[PDB]
Amino acid sequence: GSSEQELKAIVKDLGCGPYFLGTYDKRFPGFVSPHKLACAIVNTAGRETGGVHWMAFAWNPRSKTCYLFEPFGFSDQRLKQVYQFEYESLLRRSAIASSPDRCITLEKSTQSVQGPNSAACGLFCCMFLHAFANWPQTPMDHNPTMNLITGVPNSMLNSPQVQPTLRRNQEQLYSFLERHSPYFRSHSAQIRSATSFCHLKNM
Amino acid sequence: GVQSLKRRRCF
């Protein structure tokens, strides 16, 4: 997988520093940023347990949109079932601190970009945050970064027929990082091995 | 990229 130190260096290389709050566990409080773009990488587990899975949250203060990009695109019920993760409190806190009307639009990905056995979740979150820092009104799709990868229905995550698309996404992710991150370039072989497409495949 | 769902949430 990816450690926090790795993800912070790569998000800084991709130009997201001006908006990046850092890496957090499931207790990420939410956004206190009524007038500034902001984003964060958040784990589904608590720091006590050790990391489990990475997601990215991002906030556009002009449209009052809170984006959630979790690389498998699970539904809210599946996030609670699979990872015991819920994010109602951070949405509530974000709306009360950051919008005079106490309302926001939540826009969340509903497709998987990551293979079921891949350990590249944190790297996909970095890639989405480059998309957000440059296209904060359309980060999920229809932008030069996200056009390199292709989501598939989360209900088809384990089906053979979507694997080539998910493997192509992983290849495009690593190539994107080679062109934009000196830190990834200098740790290329190591990060590709620790995050590989079938890193977690059953034996 | 990915398709997404939008939901308005007020508190």
Coordinates of N, CA and C in Angstrom, one line a residue:
Chain A
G1 N 0.9 -1.2 0.0 CA 0.0 0.0 0.0 C 0.9 1.3 0.0
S2 N 0.3 2.4 0.4 CA 1.0 3.7 0.4 C 0.9 4.3 1.8
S3 N 2.1 4.8 2.3 CA 2.1 5.4 3.7 C 1.7 6.9 3.5
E4 N 1.4 7.5 4.7 CA 1.0 8.9 4.6 C 2.1 9.8 4.0
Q5 N 3.4 9.5 4.4 CA 4.5 10.2 4.0 C 4.6 10.2 2.5
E6 N 4.4 9.0 1.9 CA 4.4 8.9 0.4 C 3.3 9.7 -0.2
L7 N 2.1 9.7 0.3 CA 1.0 10.4 -0.3 C 1.2 11.9 -0.1
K8 N 1.7 12.3 1.0 CA 1.9 13.8 1.1 C 2.9 14.3 0.2
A9 N 4.0 13.5 0.0 CA 5.1 14.0 -1.0 C 4.5 14.1 -2.4
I10 N 3.7 13.1 -2.8 CA 3.2 13.0 -4.2 C 2.1 14.1 -4.4
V11 N 1.3 14.3 -3.4 CA 0.3 15.4 -3.6 C 0.9 16.8 -3.7
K12 N 2.1 17.0 -3.0 CA 2.8 18.3 -3.1 C 3.4 18.4 -4.5
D13 N 3.9 17.2 -5.0 CA 4.5 17.3 -6.4 C 3.5 17.6 -7.4
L14 N 2.3 17.2 -7.2 CA 1.2 17.4 -8.2 C 0.6 18.8 -8.2
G15 N 1.1 19.7 -7.3 CA 0.7 21.1 -7.3 C -0.5 21.3 -6.4
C16 N -0.9 20.4 -5.5 CA -2.0 20.5 -4.7 C -1.8 21.2 -3.4
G17 N -0.5 21.5 -3.0 CA -0.1 22.1 -1.8 C -1.0 23.2 -1.3
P18 N -1.3 24.2 -2.1 CA -2.1 25.3 -1.7 C -3.4 25.0 -1.1
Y19 N -4.0 23.8 -1.5 CA -5.3 23.4 -1.0 C -5.3 22.2 -0.1
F20 N -4.2 21.5 0.1 CA -4.1 20.2 0.8 C -4.0 20.3 2.2
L21 N -5.0 19.8 3.0 CA -5.0 19.9 4.4 C -4.1 18.8 5.0
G22 N -3.9 17.7 4.3 CA -3.0 16.6 4.8 C -3.8 15.3 4.7
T23 N -3.2 14.3 5.4 CA -3.7 13.0 5.5 C -4.3 12.8 6.9
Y24 N -5.5 12.1 6.9 CA -6.2 11.9 8.2 C -6.7 10.4 8.2
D25 N -7.1 10.0 9.5 CA -7.9 8.8 9.7 C -9.4 9.1 9.6
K26 N -10.2 8.1 9.9 CA -11.7 8.3 9.8 C -12.2 9.5 10.5
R27 N -11.5 10.0 11.5 CA -12.0 11.1 12.3 C -11.8 12.5 11.6
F28 N -11.4 12.5 10.4 CA -11.3 13.9 9.7 C -12.5 14.7 10.0
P29 N -12.3 15.9 10.6 CA -13.4 16.7 11.1 C -14.4 17.2 10.0
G30 N -13.8 17.5 8.9 CA -14.6 18.1 7.8 C -13.9 19.4 7.4
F31 N -14.6 20.2 6.6 CA -13.9 21.5 6.1 C -14.4 22.7 6.8
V32 N -13.5 23.5 7.2 CA -13.7 24.9 7.8 C -13.1 25.9 6.8
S33 N -13.8 26.1 5.7 CA -13.2 26.8 4.6 C -14.2 27.4 3.7
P34 N -14.9 28.4 4.3 CA -16.0 29.1 3.5 C -15.5 29.7 2.2
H35 N -14.2 30.1 2.2 CA -13.8 30.9 1.0 C -12.6 30.4 0.3
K36 N -12.2 29.1 0.6 CA -11.0 28.6 0.0 C -11.2 27.1 -0.5
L37 N -10.6 26.8 -1.6 CA -10.6 25.4 -2.1 C -9.8 24.6 -1.1
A38 N -10.3 23.4 -0.7 CA -9.5 22.5 0.2 C -9.7 21.1 -0.1
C39 N -8.8 20.2 0.3 CA -8.9 18.7 0.0 C -8.2 18.0 1.1
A40 N -8.4 16.7 1.2 CA -7.7 15.9 2.2 C -7.8 14.4 1.7
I41 N -6.8 13.6 2.2 CA -6.9 12.2 1.9 C -7.2 11.5 3.3
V42 N -8.2 10.7 3.3 CA -8.8 10.2 4.6 C -8.8 8.7 4.6
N43 N -8.4 8.0 5.7 CA -8.5 6.6 5.8 C -9.8 6.1 6.3
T44 N -10.3 4.9 5.9 CA -11.6 4.4 6.4 C -11.4 3.9 7.9
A45 N -10.2 3.7 8.3 CA -9.9 3.2 9.7 C -9.3 4.3 10.5
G46 N -9.2 4.0 11.8 CA -8.6 4.9 12.8 C -7.1 4.7 12.9
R47 N -6.4 5.7 13.3 CA -4.9 5.6 13.4 C -4.5 4.4 14.4
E48 N -5.3 4.2 15.4 CA -5.0 3.0 16.3 C -4.8 1.7 15.6
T49 N -5.7 1.4 14.7 CA -5.8 0.1 13.9 C -4.7 0.0 12.9
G50 N -4.3 1.1 12.4 CA -3.4 1.0 11.2 C -4.3 1.3 10.0
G51 N -3.7 1.9 8.9 CA -4.5 2.2 7.7 C -5.1 0.9 7.1
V52 N -6.3 1.1 6.4 CA -7.0 0.1 5.8 C -7.2 0.5 4.3
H53 N -7.8 1.6 4.1 CA -8.2 2.0 2.7 C -8.2 3.6 2.6
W54 N -7.7 4.1 1.5 CA -7.7 5.6 1.3 C -8.8 6.1 0.4
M55 N -9.3 7.3 0.8 CA -10.3 8.0 0.0 C -9.9 9.5 -0.1
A56 N -10.5 10.2 -1.1 CA -10.2 11.7 -1.1 C -11.5 12.5 -0.9
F57 N -11.4 13.5 -0.1 CA -12.5 14.4 0.0 C -12.0 15.8 -0.5
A58 N -12.9 16.5 -1.2 CA -12.4 17.8 -1.7 C -13.6 18.8 -1.5
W59 N -13.3 20.1 -1.5 CA -14.3 21.1 -1.1 C -14.2 22.3 -2.1
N60 N -15.3 22.7 -2.8 CA -15.3 23.9 -3.6 C -16.2 24.9 -2.9
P61 N -15.6 26.0 -2.3 CA -16.3 27.0 -1.6 C -17.2 27.8 -2.4
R62 N -17.0 27.9 -3.7 CA -17.9 28.8 -4.5 C -19.1 28.0 -4.9
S63 N -19.1 26.7 -5.2 CA -20.3 25.9 -5.4 C -20.8 25.2 -4.2
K64 N -20.1 25.3 -3.1 CA -20.5 24.6 -1.9 C -20.7 23.1 -2.2
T65 N -19.7 22.6 -2.9 CA -19.7 21.1 -3.2 C -18.6 20.4 -2.4
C66 N -19.0 19.3 -1.8 CA -18.1 18.4 -1.1 C -18.0 17.1 -2.0
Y67 N -16.8 16.9 -2.5 CA -16.6 15.7 -3.4 C -16.1 14.5 -2.5
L68 N -16.6 13.3 -2.8 CA -16.0 12.1 -2.2 C -15.5 11.2 -3.4
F69 N -14.3 10.9 -3.4 CA -13.8 10.0 -4.5 C -13.2 8.8 -3.7
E70 N -13.9 7.7 -3.6 CA -13.4 6.5 -2.9 C -13.2 5.5 -4.1
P71 N -12.0 5.0 -4.3 CA -11.7 4.3 -5.6 C -12.5 3.2 -6.0
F72 N -13.1 2.5 -5.1 CA -14.0 1.4 -5.5 C -15.4 1.9 -5.8
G73 N -15.8 3.1 -5.4 CA -17.2 3.6 -5.7 C -18.2 2.9 -4.9
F74 N -17.9 2.3 -3.7 CA -19.0 1.6 -3.0 C -20.1 2.5 -2.6
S75 N -21.3 1.9 -2.4 CA -22.4 2.7 -1.9 C -22.2 3.0 -0.4
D76 N -23.0 3.9 0.2 CA -22.8 4.3 1.5 C -23.0 3.1 2.5
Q77 N -24.0 2.3 2.2 CA -24.2 1.1 2.9 C -23.1 0.1 2.8
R78 N -22.5 -0.1 1.6 CA -21.3 -0.9 1.5 C -20.1 -0.4 2.2
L79 N -20.0 1.0 2.3 CA -18.8 1.5 3.0 C -18.9 1.1 4.5
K80 N -20.1 1.2 5.0 CA -20.3 0.8 6.4 C -20.2 -0.7 6.6
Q81 N -20.7 -1.5 5.7 CA -20.6 -2.9 5.8 C -19.1 -3.4 5.6
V82 N -18.4 -3.0 4.6 CA -17.1 -3.4 4.3 C -16.1 -2.8 5.2
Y83 N -16.2 -1.5 5.5 CA -15.1 -0.8 6.2 C -15.5 -0.1 7.5
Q84 N -16.7 -0.3 7.9 CA -17.2 0.4 9.1 C -17.0 1.9 9.1
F85 N -17.1 2.4 7.9 CA -16.9 3.9 7.7 C -18.2 4.6 7.4
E86 N -18.5 5.7 8.1 CA -19.6 6.6 7.8 C -19.1 8.0 7.8
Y87 N -19.7 8.9 7.1 CA -19.1 10.3 7.0 C -20.1 11.4 7.2
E88 N -21.2 11.0 7.8 CA -22.3 12.0 8.1 C -21.8 13.2 8.9
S89 N -21.0 12.9 10.0 CA -20.6 13.9 10.9 C -19.7 14.9 10.2
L90 N -18.8 14.5 9.3 CA -17.9 15.4 8.6 C -18.7 16.2 7.6
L91 N -19.8 15.6 7.0 CA -20.5 16.5 6.1 C -21.3 17.6 6.9
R92 N -21.8 17.2 8.0 CA -22.6 18.2 8.8 C -21.7 19.3 9.3
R93 N -20.5 18.9 9.8 CA -19.5 19.9 10.3 C -19.1 20.8 9.2
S94 N -18.9 20.3 8.0 CA -18.4 21.1 6.8 C -19.5 22.1 6.4
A95 N -20.8 21.7 6.4 CA -21.9 22.6 6.0 C -22.0 23.7 7.0
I96 N -22.0 23.4 8.3 CA -22.2 24.4 9.4 C -21.1 25.4 9.4
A97 N -19.8 25.0 9.2 CA -18.7 25.9 9.2 C -18.5 26.7 7.9
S98 N -18.8 26.0 6.8 CA -18.5 26.6 5.5 C -19.6 27.1 4.6
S99 N -20.8 27.0 4.9 CA -21.9 27.5 4.1 C -22.9 28.3 5.0
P100 N -23.1 29.6 4.7 CA -24.1 30.3 5.5 C -25.4 29.7 5.6
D101 N -25.9 29.0 4.5 CA -27.2 28.3 4.6 C -27.1 26.9 5.2
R102 N -26.0 26.5 5.7 CA -25.9 25.1 6.3 C -26.2 24.0 5.3
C103 N -26.1 24.3 4.0 CA -26.4 23.3 3.0 C -25.1 23.1 2.1
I104 N -25.0 21.8 1.6 CA -23.9 21.6 0.6 C -24.5 20.6 -0.4
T105 N -23.8 20.5 -1.5 CA -24.0 19.4 -2.4 C -22.9 18.3 -2.2
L106 N -23.3 17.1 -1.9 CA -22.3 16.0 -1.9 C -22.3 15.4 -3.3
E107 N -21.1 15.3 -3.9 CA -21.0 14.6 -5.2 C -20.0 13.5 -5.0
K108 N -20.5 12.3 -5.1 CA -19.6 11.1 -4.8 C -19.5 10.2 -6.0
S109 N -18.3 9.6 -6.2 CA -18.1 8.7 -7.3 C -18.9 7.4 -7.0
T110 N -19.5 6.9 -8.1 CA -20.3 5.7 -8.0 C -19.7 4.5 -8.8
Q111 N -18.4 4.6 -9.2 CA -17.9 3.5 -10.0 C -16.5 3.1 -9.5
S112 N -16.0 1.9 -9.8 CA -14.7 1.5 -9.4 C -13.7 1.9 -10.5
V113 N -12.5 2.4 -10.1 CA -11.4 2.6 -10.9 C -10.2 1.6 -10.6
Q114 N -10.4 1.0 -9.3 CA -9.3 0.1 -8.8 C -9.7 -1.3 -8.9
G115 N -8.7 -2.2 -9.2 CA -8.9 -3.6 -9.2 C -9.1 -4.2 -7.8
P116 N -9.9 -5.2 -7.7 CA -10.3 -5.8 -6.4 C -9.1 -6.2 -5.6
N117 N -8.0 -6.6 -6.3 CA -6.8 -7.1 -5.6 C -5.7 -6.0 -5.6
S118 N -6.0 -4.8 -6.1 CA -4.9 -3.7 -6.2 C -4.7 -3.1 -4.8
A119 N -3.4 -2.6 -4.7 CA -3.2 -1.8 -3.4 C -2.8 -0.4 -3.8
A120 N -3.4 0.1 -4.9 CA -3.1 1.5 -5.3 C -4.1 2.5 -4.9
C121 N -5.0 2.3 -4.0 CA -6.0 3.2 -3.6 C -5.4 4.6 -3.3
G122 N -4.4 4.8 -2.5 CA -3.8 6.1 -2.1 C -3.3 6.8 -3.4
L123 N -2.7 6.1 -4.3 CA -2.2 6.7 -5.5 C -3.4 7.2 -6.3
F124 N -4.4 6.4 -6.5 CA -5.6 7.0 -7.2 C -6.1 8.2 -6.6
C125 N -6.2 8.3 -5.2 CA -6.6 9.5 -4.6 C -5.7 10.7 -4.9
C126 N -4.4 10.5 -5.0 CA -3.5 11.6 -5.4 C -3.9 12.1 -6.8
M127 N -4.1 11.2 -7.8 CA -4.5 11.5 -9.1 C -5.8 12.3 -9.2
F128 N -6.8 11.9 -8.4 CA -8.0 12.6 -8.4 C -7.8 14.0 -7.8
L129 N -6.9 14.2 -6.8 CA -6.7 15.5 -6.3 C -5.9 16.4 -7.2
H130 N -5.1 15.9 -8.1 CA -4.6 16.8 -9.2 C -5.7 17.3 -10.1
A131 N -6.7 16.4 -10.4 CA -7.8 16.8 -11.2 C -8.6 17.9 -10.5
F132 N -8.9 17.7 -9.2 CA -9.6 18.7 -8.4 C -8.9 20.0 -8.4
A133 N -7.6 20.0 -8.1 CA -6.8 21.3 -8.0 C -6.9 22.0 -9.3
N134 N -7.0 21.3 -10.4 CA -7.0 22.1 -11.7 C -8.4 22.2 -12.3
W135 N -9.4 21.4 -12.0 CA -10.7 21.5 -12.5 C -11.7 21.2 -11.4
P136 N -11.8 22.2 -10.4 CA -12.6 22.0 -9.2 C -14.1 22.1 -9.4
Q137 N -14.6 22.3 -10.6 CA -16.0 22.2 -10.9 C -16.4 20.9 -11.7
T138 N -15.3 20.2 -12.1 CA -15.6 18.9 -12.8 C -14.5 17.9 -12.6
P139 N -14.2 17.6 -11.3 CA -13.1 16.7 -11.0 C -13.3 15.3 -11.3
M140 N -14.5 14.8 -11.3 CA -14.7 13.3 -11.4 C -14.5 12.9 -12.9
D141 N -14.8 13.7 -13.9 CA -14.7 13.2 -15.3 C -14.6 14.4 -16.2
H142 N -14.4 14.1 -17.5 CA -14.4 15.2 -18.4 C -13.3 16.2 -18.0
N143 N -12.1 15.8 -17.7 CA -10.9 16.6 -17.5 C -9.7 15.8 -17.9
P144 N -8.6 16.5 -18.3 CA -7.5 15.8 -18.9 C -6.9 14.7 -18.0
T145 N -7.0 14.9 -16.6 CA -6.4 13.8 -15.7 C -7.4 12.6 -15.7
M146 N -8.6 12.9 -15.3 CA -9.5 11.8 -15.1 C -9.9 11.1 -16.4
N147 N -9.7 11.8 -17.5 CA -10.0 11.1 -18.8 C -9.1 9.9 -19.0
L148 N -7.9 9.8 -18.3 CA -7.0 8.7 -18.5 C -7.5 7.4 -17.9
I149 N -8.4 7.5 -17.0 CA -8.9 6.3 -16.3 C -10.4 6.1 -16.5
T150 N -10.9 4.9 -16.3 CA -12.3 4.6 -16.6 C -13.0 3.8 -15.5
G151 N -14.0 4.4 -15.0 CA -14.8 3.7 -13.9 C -15.6 2.6 -14.5
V152 N -15.9 1.6 -13.7 CA -16.9 0.5 -14.0 C -17.9 0.3 -12.9
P153 N -19.1 -0.3 -13.2 CA -20.1 -0.4 -12.1 C -19.5 -1.2 -10.9
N154 N -19.7 -0.6 -9.7 CA -19.2 -1.3 -8.5 C -19.7 -2.7 -8.4
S155 N -20.9 -2.9 -8.9 CA -21.5 -4.3 -8.8 C -20.7 -5.3 -9.7
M156 N -19.9 -4.8 -10.5 CA -19.1 -5.7 -11.4 C -17.6 -5.7 -11.0
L157 N -17.3 -5.2 -9.9 CA -15.9 -5.1 -9.4 C -15.1 -6.4 -9.6
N158 N -15.7 -7.6 -9.3 CA -15.0 -8.8 -9.3 C -15.1 -9.6 -10.6
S159 N -15.9 -9.1 -11.6 CA -16.2 -9.8 -12.8 C -15.0 -9.9 -13.7
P160 N -14.7 -11.0 -14.4 CA -13.6 -11.0 -15.3 C -13.6 -9.9 -16.3
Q161 N -14.8 -9.6 -16.9 CA -14.9 -8.7 -18.0 C -14.4 -7.3 -17.8
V162 N -14.4 -6.8 -16.5 CA -13.9 -5.4 -16.3 C -12.4 -5.4 -15.9
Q163 N -11.8 -6.5 -15.7 CA -10.4 -6.5 -15.3 C -9.5 -5.8 -16.2
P164 N -9.6 -6.0 -17.5 CA -8.6 -5.3 -18.4 C -8.8 -3.8 -18.3
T165 N -10.0 -3.3 -18.1 CA -10.1 -1.8 -17.9 C -9.5 -1.4 -16.6
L166 N -9.7 -2.1 -15.5 CA -9.1 -1.8 -14.2 C -7.6 -1.9 -14.2
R167 N -7.0 -2.9 -15.0 CA -5.5 -3.0 -15.1 C -5.0 -1.9 -16.0
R168 N -5.7 -1.5 -17.0 CA -5.3 -0.3 -17.8 C -5.3 0.9 -16.9
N169 N -6.3 1.1 -16.0 CA -6.3 2.2 -15.2 C -5.0 2.3 -14.3
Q170 N -4.7 1.1 -13.8 CA -3.4 1.1 -12.9 C -2.2 1.5 -13.8
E171 N -2.1 1.0 -15.0 CA -0.9 1.4 -15.8 C -1.0 2.9 -16.1
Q172 N -2.2 3.4 -16.4 CA -2.2 4.9 -16.7 C -1.9 5.7 -15.5
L173 N -2.3 5.2 -14.3 CA -2.0 5.9 -13.0 C -0.5 6.0 -12.8
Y174 N 0.2 4.8 -13.0 CA 1.7 4.9 -12.8 C 2.3 5.8 -13.8
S175 N 1.9 5.8 -15.1 CA 2.5 6.6 -16.1 C 2.2 8.1 -15.8
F176 N 1.0 8.4 -15.3 CA 0.7 9.8 -14.9 C 1.6 10.3 -13.8
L177 N 1.9 9.4 -12.8 CA 2.8 9.8 -11.7 C 4.2 9.9 -12.2
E178 N 4.6 9.1 -13.1 CA 6.0 9.3 -13.6 C 6.2 10.6 -14.3
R179 N 5.1 11.1 -15.0 CA 5.3 12.4 -15.7 C 5.1 13.6 -14.7
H180 N 4.5 13.4 -13.6 CA 4.2 14.6 -12.8 C 4.9 14.6 -11.4
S181 N 5.6 13.5 -11.0 CA 6.1 13.5 -9.6 C 7.5 13.0 -9.5
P182 N 8.4 13.9 -9.2 CA 9.8 13.5 -8.9 C 9.9 12.5 -7.8
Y183 N 9.1 12.6 -6.8 CA 9.1 11.6 -5.7 C 8.8 10.2 -6.2
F184 N 7.7 10.1 -7.0 CA 7.3 8.8 -7.6 C 8.4 8.3 -8.5
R185 N 9.0 9.2 -9.4 CA 10.1 8.7 -10.2 C 11.2 8.1 -9.5
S186 N 11.6 8.7 -8.4 CA 12.8 8.2 -7.7 C 12.5 7.0 -6.8
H187 N 11.2 6.7 -6.6 CA 10.9 5.5 -5.8 C 10.0 4.6 -6.7
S188 N 10.1 4.6 -8.0 CA 9.2 4.0 -9.0 C 9.0 2.5 -8.8
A189 N 10.1 1.8 -8.8 CA 10.1 0.3 -8.7 C 9.5 -0.1 -7.4
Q190 N 9.9 0.5 -6.3 CA 9.4 0.2 -5.0 C 7.9 0.5 -4.8
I191 N 7.5 1.7 -5.3 CA 6.0 2.0 -5.1 C 5.2 1.1 -6.0
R192 N 5.7 0.8 -7.3 CA 4.9 -0.1 -8.2 C 4.8 -1.5 -7.5
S193 N 5.8 -2.0 -6.8 CA 5.7 -3.3 -6.2 C 4.8 -3.3 -5.0
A194 N 4.8 -2.3 -4.2 CA 4.0 -2.3 -3.0 C 2.5 -2.0 -3.3
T195 N 2.2 -1.5 -4.6 CA 0.8 -1.1 -4.8 C 0.2 -1.9 -5.9
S196 N 0.9 -2.9 -6.5 CA 0.6 -3.6 -7.7 C -0.9 -4.1 -7.8
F197 N -1.3 -4.3 -9.1 CA -2.6 -4.7 -9.5 C -3.1 -5.9 -8.8
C198 N -2.2 -6.9 -8.6 CA -2.7 -8.1 -7.9 C -1.9 -8.3 -6.6
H199 N -1.6 -7.2 -6.0 CA -0.8 -7.3 -4.7 C -1.5 -8.1 -3.6
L200 N -2.8 -8.0 -3.6 CA -3.6 -8.7 -2.6 C -4.4 -9.9 -3.1
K201 N -4.0 -10.4 -4.2 CA -4.8 -11.6 -4.8 C -4.7 -12.8 -3.8
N202 N -5.8 -13.5 -3.6 CA -5.8 -14.7 -2.8 C -4.9 -15.8 -3.4
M203 N -4.3 -16.6 -2.5 CA -3.5 -17.7 -3.0 C -4.1 -19.1 -2.6
Chain B
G1 N -13.1 8.9 -16.8 CA -13.1 9.2 -15.3 C -14.3 8.4 -14.7
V2 N -14.9 8.9 -13.6 CA -16.0 8.2 -12.9 C -17.3 8.9 -13.0
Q3 N -18.4 8.2 -13.1 CA -19.7 8.8 -13.0 C -20.0 9.0 -11.5
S4 N -20.9 9.9 -11.2 CA -21.1 10.3 -9.8 C -22.5 10.6 -9.5
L5 N -22.9 10.6 -8.2 CA -24.3 11.0 -7.8 C -24.2 12.3 -7.0
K6 N -25.1 13.2 -7.2 CA -25.1 14.5 -6.5 C -26.3 14.5 -5.5
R7 N -26.1 14.9 -4.3 CA -27.3 15.0 -3.4 C -27.2 16.3 -2.6
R8 N -28.3 17.0 -2.5 CA -28.2 18.3 -1.6 C -28.4 17.8 -0.2
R9 N -27.6 18.3 0.7 CA -27.7 18.0 2.1 C -27.7 19.3 3.0
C10 N -28.8 19.5 3.8 CA -28.9 20.7 4.6 C -28.9 20.3 6.1
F11 N -28.3 21.1 6.9 CA -28.2 20.7 8.3 C -28.7 21.8 9.3

